[PDB]
């Protein structure tokens, strides 16, 4: 279930072990653009929120 | 060097180096001016001595 462009849902993710390797590995995920960060270093960073 | 990849973070490091060199050249110029001032003062002090 995904909402429209307006009144979009917001999910807070915190206190968990992140693993971005399972994100860009999917085949249909053609568009993967990042701003201010690199896709290869996503699994080595630490985010406060 | 940890958030972004080196091939995508080269311009940031270049701009940082440029800014630091520009900030250090002004310090070198101020040091040269103050050294000339101190040299003139020391010459005057030696003449008075």
Swiss-Prot record, chain B:
Query: What does the record say mutating residue 47 to I does?
Result: In strain: Gamma/P.1
Could you tell me what this protein does?
Subunit of the fusion protein that is processed upon entry into the host cell. Mediates fusion of the virion and cellular membranes by functioning as a class I viral fusion protein. Contains a viral fusion peptide that is unmasked after S2 cleavage. This cleavage can occur at the cell membrane by host TMPRSS2 or during endocytosis by host CSTL. In either case, this triggers an extensive and irreversible conformational change that leads to fusion of the viral envelope with the cellular cytoplasmic membrane, releasing viral genomic RNA into the host cell cytoplasm.
* Protein name listed in UniProt: Spike protein S2'
What species is this protein from?
A: Severe acute respiratory syndrome coronavirus 2
Protein encoded by which gene: S
């Amino acid at each position: 279930r995904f909402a429209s462009v307006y009144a979009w849902n917001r999910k807070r993710i915190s206190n968990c072990v992140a693993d971005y390797s399972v994100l860009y590995n999917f085949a249909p995920f053609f568009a993967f653009k990042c701003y201010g960060v690199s896709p290869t270093k996503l699994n080595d960073l630490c985010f406060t929120n | 060097l940890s958030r972004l990849d080196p091939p995508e973070a080269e311009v940031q490091i270049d701009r940082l180096i440029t800014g630091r060199l520009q900030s250090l050249q002004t310090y070198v110029t101020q040091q040269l001016i103050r050294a000339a001032e101190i040299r003139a003062s020391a010459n005057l002090a030696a003449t008075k001595m």
